[PDB]
Each structure stands twice: as structure tokens, then as C-alpha cells.
């Protein structure tokens with residue numbers, strides 16, 4: 001796409017001007033989406049004038065380990081796609097790794113979900129297209145999919161944010177903190193290990209969460225649906241592994257959307273749909289030919305002006 005080629009080359013143009021990144025070059029503007037493994041700040045890169053998002057991972061380790069993490073992250077400089085958050089750079093300074101990224105003014109979809117209550121079907125169609133393309137980019141040029149990892153902006157863009165190219169980095173945060181496992185596929189929880197197929201599962205679950213406005217397991221056996229229209233993490237993960245997958249309620253959502261998530265959420269990974277299959281699924285082909293005002297919906301919902 002041409003508007004997409006123009007924005008990708010504008011990004012790189014701006015990025016070519018920045019040069020090597022250093023702590024003392026950054027001014028704090030605010031804190032964003034803080035929590036998780038590290039805090040995140042909106043920052044100004046004073047020399048260039050660029051606003052950026054900076055993730056800080058407090059870690060105390062050997063100069064070797066950190067020099068390795070920094071080099072493994074350089075990998076992200078070649079990942080240029082409209083569906084992946086722009087990466088400016090990564091460095092270490094005074095006990096903490098920094099990862100600097102394009103500032104997505106819409107934030108992440110967990111935040112948008114909190115504010116909107118639930119995300120409409122037609123918007124989730126756009127989200128689905130972006131995630132599928134994003135995931136198709138990562139496979140064709142070589143993950144953890146959940147609402148907090150999908151960022152959005154006022155230009156209508158939807159992108160994945162991920163720093164798990166390193167691994168060793170993840171290696172060394174385990175003793176410090178560990179990201180939630182409540183989006184992992186039953187076959188990762190049973191140890192079989194990743195395939196792109198486990199990210200389809202996660203995409204499916206995230207979409208149901210955003211549709212209904214709540215983490216969907218366990219099902220809302222209640223009038224909560226009627227209202228709509230406790231489990232410890234270990235009870236939950238058994239539940240994922242042993243019980244049937246969640247689904248959308250009926251009536252409220254189109255059958256095509258129901259079917260799309262059902263196919264992402266099939267427990268057996270061999271039977272669960274693949275990306276080639278999702279790309280041509282009817283929900284997707286229909287969503288692709290709707291012209292949905294995502295920016296307009298987004299700006300209204302979170303109060304961007």
C-alpha cells in the first residue's frame with residue numbers, strides 16, 4: 001500500500017537522524033502503561049526533538065549478559081512493518097535496560113478496553129486484520145498476543161509491541177518478574193511449545209475479552225450476560241487446559257465473528273486454524289471491505305483532542 005510505504009519511509013528518515021541513544025539524552029514527559037516488567041515513560045529525545053516511549057527494565061547483571069541483550073535487540077532495527085511498533089533503539093544505563101519505541105498516542109487495547117467497556121465488532125475486525133498481518137510479518141521474516149500488547153494511534157494504526165526477540169533478556173527477568181500466562185494456549189500450558197498456532201489462540205482469547213469487556217475464563221455463568229447485554233492463576237490454567245474454550249455469546253455478535261474466534265480457540269493446535277486460513281476467513285474478508293472509522297471511534301472513546 002502507498003500511504004503505508006510513505007509512512008514507513010518517513011519513520012526511517014526520522015530515525016536515521018537520531019543516531020546512538022544515551023540516557024542523558026532523554027527528558028521525561030509522563031508515565032504510560034506503567035506496570036508489568038518495567039515502567040514505561042513518554043519521553044522527549046532532546047537532540048532530535050522526537051517523542052518516544054521508553055521501557056525501562058531494572059536488572060542487575062554482568063557486563064557480558066547486558067552487552068548480549070543489547071546486541072540481540074539490534075535485531076529489531078530490521079523489523080520494518082506497518083503492523084509492528086517502530087523501534088528506535090535499545091541501551092543499558094545505571095542498572096536498567098532501555099527500549100525505545102514509537103509513541104502510539106492511543107495506548108494499548110487493555111487501556112482502551114477499560115475506558116470503552118467493550119469494543120465493537122467492526123473495530124475488532126480491523127484489529128484482527130492488523131494482528132494477523134503483524135503475525136504474518138514476524139513468521140515470513142524469522143511471541144505473546146494480548147490486549148496490552150496491541151497499541152493504537154489517532155491515525156487509525158494498529159500494531160504489535162514486542163521485545164521477545166532477545167530471549168536472554170526474558171531469561172534474566174524471570175528471577176525478577178514474569179508476565180501473565182493466562183493468554184497461553186492449552187498446548188503451551190501442557191509444554192508442547194510454541195508454533196504460530198499458539199498466538200492464534202491468544203489472538204482468539206483477546207478478541208473475546210475485548211468483545212465482551214472481561215477476561216472470558218471462566219464463562220460468565222450468570223445473568224452477567226444479562227447484566228452485560230474467584231479463581232487463582234493456577235486454578236485458571238488448569239481450567240484452560242481441562243475445560244472447553246470460551247466463546248462469544250449468541251444474538252449479540254454476527255455468526256461470522258463467532259466462527260472466526262471459535263476457529264482460533266479450538267484446543268487441538270493441528271485443527272485450530274492457521275494464518276493463511278484466517279486471512280481468507282469470512283469475518284476477515286468482510287471486515288476488510290468495511291470502511292470503518294477506527295480513528296474517529298478511537299478519538300471519541302478515549303477523549304483524544
Ligand SMILES: *[C@H]1CC(=O)[C@@H](O)[C@@H](O)C/C=C/c2cc(NC)cc(O)c2C(=O)O[C@@H](C)[C@@H]1C
Pocket residue numbers: 032033034036040053054055085099100101102103104105106107108148149151161162163
Ligand atoms: C510495548 C509492549 C509493552 O511492554 C506493553 O506492556 C505495553 O502495554 C506498555 C505500554 C506501552 C506504551 C504505551 C503508550 N501509551 C500512550 C504508548 C506506547 O508507544 C507504548 C509503547 O510503545 O510501549 C513500548 C515501549 C513497549 C515495549
Ligand SMILES: [Mg+2]
Pocket residue numbers: 023024093
Ligand atoms: Mg545518566
